[PDB]
Ligand binder design. Structure first.
Ligand SMILES: CC(=O)N[C@H]1[C@@H](O[C@H]2[C@@H](O)[C@@H](CO)O[C@H](O)[C@@H]2O[C@@H]2O[C@@H](C)[C@@H](O)[C@@H](O)[C@@H]2O)O[C@H](CO)[C@H](O)[C@@H]1O
Ligand SMILES: CC(=O)N[C@H]1[C@@H](O[C@H]2[C@@H](O)[C@@H](CO)O[C@H](O)[C@@H]2O[C@@H]2O[C@@H](C)[C@@H](O)[C@@H](O)[C@@H]2O)O[C@H](CO)[C@H](O)[C@@H]1O
Ligand code: MG
Ligand code: MG
Lengths: 306, 305
């Protein structure tokens, strides 16, 4: 006697990217080439994995205290807390504090401070900041990241929040690479407690992504960030905790006014989608369209071509 | 009829429905007019005011910059709906969904990505401010004007505003979270508003989900109170459970002990009251959360908090 699995009923423009805090723009299927993102990872029965947490406002955000500065470009040393303000434990079974960026590049946004304690408590300030995940001081698993900021003369050793706005390539030839994980513990250390890599395991199938074009801060980068499942699905699965009756859920993309099924896809137990197609392809489908759960199938189910 | 329910979420697992940040605490306020337009949803899932579903849409703008004027609010942003579709000023809403619903300055960043003939694909981003006091703050009519940091690196191109925090204006116009902007500017009346909310039973006060949002200078506490959090709104929209009476009795429970800490009235139009007298920041366990108990009526007497 099992609680029925389901998806939330949401159009693309009603969905949030689970790897960057912006709406989904489109669906995209990619040729097979290793996909192992750590944000936007959740099993169909509601187990969050990787660095995945529940709030869109937490994705690629940091919270903590600035405690030091060094004479490097990555100047300001931020000791991290968990996003809910609780003390971060580096021995926890996670790759990094939940919400940590899961790509190589620079995240730009703003830092804000609000003093506590004896030194002008309640005083505030905010300004533009950058976090490079290429940096040798990007060591969130160990408990800290270093920030670049706009105004070094108006910044204190106080509680600090980083609010992400967009991404970009780093200079000196460090490109934005959305499928390359940072070294969460820095140079010469292996990432651990990772959500596993995902790939199609059936001939003729490709991954399907929920794609966003996020803001960039200069140059011509398209700002592409692809996620496996949107944040609202993760939030839904976490609530429902419906048992998975097989390794594969058949889902269908439906147009609610016509009632027609446009195509079908495989939603795998570990939380990603495959479709039957060959080649890079941006889908062009009706604005009111959405996936619905059809039934439980297995690994040997052959998808109708997309 | 489908049974009514709340999502099971702790305070730190909840997003403020009036500003895109997590909830920090619960607060009950002495009775003094509350008429916020974001974070408005009935228990059976009808969104109201300027309320939309995406947390990242709250206090965000999307559009095109088309002109500049020789005023502090220099850059004229013609708005689209947050999903990029054309904005219709004749729609029965107070303003485009997601528009800020308070008087003050919202600070954040603007970003552009060119299309068409001028360096297509080129991008830029910088700090920006939107004053909701501005006579050019006319989102209902289809535009707002921006202040930015660098007037020399900004084009007439597609633009997004990403909010980060709020503040008083530096000319002495205060952040007033309960004062609505004039969505159509000077000498116009706001329309299509979600109604004001207030306790209607003796001894009861409103309960808010409170956030302390970032400020950009000075000592403002950055307080933004919402009636119900964004995840509840998203839940009610999905569930569309019929409201069996005007009031859902809800209980704040400690899941580890299993004890109910206090009870409250969740009204069908989407706000909470508790039995208390005086301003009071609640201090409750981190794992605490509301659960639906039963449907009662307006005159049901709450246990004092
Ligand atoms: C510190 C400064 O004054 N930056 C200017 C500068 O920025 C350029 C520059 O960094 C070049 C490197 O040669 O890289 C970009 O071109 C960058 O500009 C950004 O990207 C281009 C494609 C445009 O979209 C531009 O608007 C954007 O800022 O020059 C730009 C003008 O091109 C601005 O003047 C910056 O402030
Ligand atoms: C334009 C400028 O020079 N900004 C400085 C400046 O800012 C001050 C100033 O604007 C006063 C005016 O009454 O208001 C604040 O004091 C403001 O500072 C901001 O608020 C105070 C409480 C601190 O938290 C401060 O860090 C914050 O910037 O002085 C500050 C240094 O105090 C900076 O130097 C700005 O760049
Ligand atoms: Mg379904
Ligand atoms: Mg419940």
């Amino acid at each position: 006697g099992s609680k029925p699995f389901s998806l939330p009923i949401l159009t693309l423009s009603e969905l949030t990217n689970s790897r960057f805090p912006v709406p989904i723009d489109s669906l995209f299927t990619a040729q097979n080439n290793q996909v192992q993102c750590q944000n936007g990872r959740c099993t169909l029965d509601g187990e969050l994995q990787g660095t995945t947490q529940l709030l869109p406002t937490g994705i690629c955000a940091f919270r903590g205290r600035v405690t030091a500065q060094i004479n490097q470009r990555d100047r300001w040393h931020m000791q991290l807390q968990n996003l809910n303000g609780t003390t971060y434990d580096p021995t926890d079974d996670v790759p990094a504090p939940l919400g940590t960026p899961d790509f190589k590049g620079v995240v730009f946004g703003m830092v804000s401070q609000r003093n506590v304690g004896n030194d002008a408590p309640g005083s505030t300030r905010a300004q533009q900041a950058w976090v490079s995940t290429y940096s040798p001081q990007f060591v969130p698993k160990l408990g800290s990241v270093n920030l670049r900021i706009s105004d070094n003369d108006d910044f204190q050793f106080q509680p600090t929040k980083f609010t992400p706005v967009g991404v970009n390539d780093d200079d000196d030839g460090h490109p934005f690479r959305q499928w390359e994980l940072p070294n969460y513990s820095g140079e010469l250390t292996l990432n651990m407690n990772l959500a596993p890599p995902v790939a199609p395991n059936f001939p003729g199938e490709q991954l399907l992504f929920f794609r966003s074009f996020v803001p960039c801060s200069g140059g011509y980068n398209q700002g592409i960030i692809d996620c496996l499942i949107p944040q609202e699905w993760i939030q839904h699965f976490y609530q429902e905790s419906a048992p998975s009756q097989s390794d594969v859920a058949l889902i269908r993309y439906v147009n609610p006014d016509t009632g027609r099924t446009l195509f079908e896809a495989k939603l795998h137990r570990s939380g990603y989608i495959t479709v039957a197609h060959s080649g890079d392809y941006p889908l062009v489908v009706p604005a009111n369209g959405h996936f619905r759960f059809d039934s439980w199938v297995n690994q040997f189910y052959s998808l109708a071509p997309m």
